[PDB]
C-alpha cells in the first residue's frame, strides 16, 4: 500500500511465482487473489 | 357486410393487381439471380414464384387479396433495392431442412406429431 | 459422504451418477465431474441436540436478521427431537 498515491493505485499485489503447482512467474491473473485479500485489494474494506 | 375497401372494390379489380405483381416478379427473377449471384436457375426461381402465388388461389375476399398484393410488392421492393442480402432471398428454398415425412407411417415412426 | 459407483464416477449429494451404459459420461473424459464434497445431510447430523427447559423454543438460525425467519418449535413429544424446518438444528426438552 501507498496512501500517497491516488485512489486506485494506492494498493497493489505482487503475485507469487508459483501457485497450486503452476508456474506463474510470467503467467499471473486476477483470479489468483484469495477471497480474504480480494476484499481488501478491491477497496471493499479498509482493513486487510 | 358493407366494409371499407383497401384498393380493389371487387375480385375482378383485385385479380388485375395480382397479375401485375406476377409480371413484376416474373421479370425480376433473372436480375435477382444475377445480382445476388444465386446458384439456382432462373427456371427454379420462377417456379418458386408460381408456387407462392398458387397457394393463395382459393382466396375470394378482395380485401385479403389486396393485403396479399401489398405484402408481395413490399417483398419485391426489398429484393429490387437490394435491401435483402443473399441469405434473405434463399430462405424461400429451405435448402438445409430435411424433407418432412408426409404419410401416416412415416410420421408414426418419427414421433407423436400428426 | 461422497462415494464412487462401480464405474468410478463420484455420486453427488443428490444421488446423481451416470449408469454404466450412459453415453453422457463422455463429457467428463479428459476433464472432471464437478462434485461438492461437504454434504449438508452429514454436516447437520453432526450438530449436538440442544437441551432447553420449555415446551416451546424459537429458532432464527443464528445471526438475528442474518439467519432465517423466526419459527417456534413444540417439544411436547419425548420420543423425538424438535427440528427446525429452516436450518435443521434439533432441540429437546430437558
Amino acid at each position: 500500500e501507498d496512501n500517497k498515491q491516488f485512489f486506485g493505485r494506492h494498493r497493489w499485489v505482487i503475485y507469487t511465482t508459483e501457485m497450486n503447482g503452476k508456474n506463474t512467474f510470467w503467467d499471473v491473473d486476477g483470479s489468483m487473489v484469495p477471497p480474504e485479500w480480494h476484499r481488501w485489494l478491491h477497496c471493499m474494506t479498509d482493513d486487510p | 357486410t358493407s366494409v371499407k375497401p383497401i384498393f380493389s372494390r371487387d375480385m375482378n379489380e383485385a385479380k388485375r393487381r395480382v397479375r401485375e405483381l406476377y409480371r413484376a416478379w416474373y421479370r425480376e427473377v433473372p436480375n435477382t439471380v444475377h445480382l445476388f449471384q444465386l446458384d439456382i436457375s432462373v427456371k427454379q426461381g420462377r417456379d418458386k414464384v408460381r408456387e407462392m402465388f398458387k397457394k393463395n388461389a382459393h382466396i375470394t375476399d378482395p380485401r385479403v387479396v389486396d393485403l396479399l398484393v401489398i405484402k408481395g410488392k413490399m417483398e419485391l421492393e426489398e429484393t429490387i433495392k437490394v435491401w435483402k442480402q443473399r441469405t434473405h432471398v434463399m430462405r424461400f428454398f429451405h435448402e438445409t431442412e430435411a424433407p418432412r415425412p408426409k404419410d401416416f407411417l412415416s410420421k408414426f415412426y418419427v414421433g407423436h406429431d400428426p | 459422504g461422497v462415494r464412487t459407483s462401480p464405474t468410478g464416477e463420484k455420486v453427488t449429494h443428490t444421488g446423481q451418477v451416470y449408469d454404466d451404459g450412459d453415453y453422457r459420461k463422455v463429457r467428463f473424459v479428459g476433464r472432471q465431474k464437478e462434485v461438492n464434497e461437504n454434504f449438508a445431510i452429514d454436516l447437520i447430523a453432526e450438530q449436538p441436540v440442544s437441551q432447553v427447559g420449555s415446551r416451546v423454543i424459537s429458532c432464527d438460525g443464528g445471526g438475528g436478521a442474518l439467519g432465517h425467519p423466526r419459527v417456534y418449535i413444540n417439544l411436547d413429544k419425548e420420543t423425538k427431537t424438535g427440528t427446525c424446518g429452516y436450518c435443521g438444528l434439533q432441540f429437546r426438552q430437558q
Binding site: - | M74, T87, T96 | -
Partner: protein, 206 residues
Amino acid sequence: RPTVRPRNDVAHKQLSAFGEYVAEILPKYVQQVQVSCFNELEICIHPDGVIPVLTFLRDHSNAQFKSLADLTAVDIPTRQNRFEIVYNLLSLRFNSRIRVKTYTDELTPIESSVPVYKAANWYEREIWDMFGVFFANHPDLRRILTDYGFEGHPFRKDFPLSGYVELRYDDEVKRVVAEPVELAQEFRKFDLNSPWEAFPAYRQPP
C-alpha cells in the same frame, strides 16, 4: 396522506370541460370522452375522424396540440376490432396533453396522419410492421423494425413470444439460414393471477 398520490381537482375539471368542448365541436366522429382519476383526457373517435379530429386539435386556437408525442396500437383479440390506435398529443401553448383513440381490424385501412404530423411517418410504419395495420396514403409504408422477409406481426397477442423461425450459420451452404424454432429450454409459463379480486371499484357486472 404520505403514501397516497394526491388528487388534482382543478385539472380534472379543466380537462372535463375541454372534453365536452371537443365533443360538441366534432360530434360527427367523437364516440366517447373520459378523464382518468390521474387526469388524462381521452377522446374515443370513429376511425373516419382521424384526420379531421387531429387537424382540429393541432390547428384550433384553443387546442394547439402541435406535437405528436406518440402513436401506437394495442391488440385486444376479444374485440371485433382488435386493434386500438392511440394518438398521444402535446400542446405547448396550454401545457397540456390529450389522447385520441380509434380502432380497426385486420382488413380495414386507417388514414395516414402524416399530413397532420410528419412525426407519424415512422410510427405508422412501426404499427404496420408490428401489428399489421395498413395505413392508407402513406408515402413509404414498409417494415421498419423486423428482419427483411419476416412473416407475421410480432406484437399481436397470438404471435408466439419466440416466433416461428430462428437463425444460425450453416457451413454447407456458407450463409445464415432460417429454420423452425427449437428451444433447449422452453419458456416456463407462470400462472400468477390470484383467485381473489383486488379492486372492487372496477368490478364488472355478473
